[PDB]
Amino acid sequence: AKVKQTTGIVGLDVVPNARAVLIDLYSKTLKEIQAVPEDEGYRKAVESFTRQRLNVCKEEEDWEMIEKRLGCGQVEELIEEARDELTLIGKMIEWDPWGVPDDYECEVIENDAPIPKHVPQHRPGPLPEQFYKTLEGLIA
């Protein structure tokens, strides 16, 4: 219920009324990627996470609850992510990389050579449920 007044990251200033700028950017992204064919997985994933993020921003107003429900980053980081996603959507539209060439071949290797426990392994924490739910929606 108070202004953030500090992000903790230099060069990334706080954005007052971040809900207003984040509630219409998502709508712009949703209305912009209608041109992408539905059969492509990029559109499904982007719609699946954009709708959930837009909803969560809809029910709750103050940024603290918004970022706690999402559980990922801060509101300004979310705004930057949304802008980058919109730019990527535009670039995808203009590039038009959709489609599979004839006689397509993809070489897939799933070798599993164990490595010691003491070598640097990037171990992250468990994700929020939406990251998994997007993958479940994509696969099925």
Binding site: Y104, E107, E110
Partner: peptide, 10 residues
């Protein structure tokens, strides 16, 4: 150890 590989078609 197995180091398997499967090619994917269209």
């Amino acid at each position: 150890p197995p180091i398997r590989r499967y090619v994917l078609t269209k």
